Amino acid sequence: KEIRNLTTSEIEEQIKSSKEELFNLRFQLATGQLEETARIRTVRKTIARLKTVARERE
RNA sequence: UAAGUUAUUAAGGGCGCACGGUGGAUGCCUUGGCACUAGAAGCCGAUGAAGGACGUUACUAACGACGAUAUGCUUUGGG
Incomplete structure (x- = not known):
């Protein structure tokens, strides 16, 4: 979605959104x-x- | 006083009509079927099939859609 960020920032983002926000909710x-x-x-x-x-x- | 004749009663029943109930025929209708015509097409699979089990929504019991990216995602056109 036009994230266009560094792939390590993509991994930090999946690991943040993946548990933290979603698991808390x-x-x-x-x-x-x-x-x-x-x-x-x-x-x-x-x-x-x-x-x-x-x-x-990829 | 005597002789004689005859009638109302309807517990219940019969017929005729009036008004209800039951049940779902018939009339009219159609979300779906039947039989065909002209034109695509006539295979999928070890890159894992056809078919299914289990799951997914803020709830979800079921049906459709979907698959741990799950009641869906990106991108290029229509609107």
Whole structure:
């Protein structure tokens, strides 16, 4: 999605979005503390884009 | 006082009509079928098939779509 960043920044980004944001929101939506639930489907799709462009670079 | 004749009763039933219930025929309709015509096409698979199991949404029991990038992603045209 026009991320156009250094591939190591792509790996830092997949590793940040991959657990931290998404895993935290998955715990919050279970223990009854997350509203703005639509964050989740945002982060998921972000973790797809960072992966696809890295695969395009190969 | 005597002789004689005759009738109302309807527990329930019969017929005729009036009004309800049941059940889903018929009329009209069609989301789908049937039989064919002209033109594509007549194979897929070890780069892992046809077919399926399990999963994916903020909930999800099921059906479609999809596959740990999961109720979908990028990019080039239409709108």
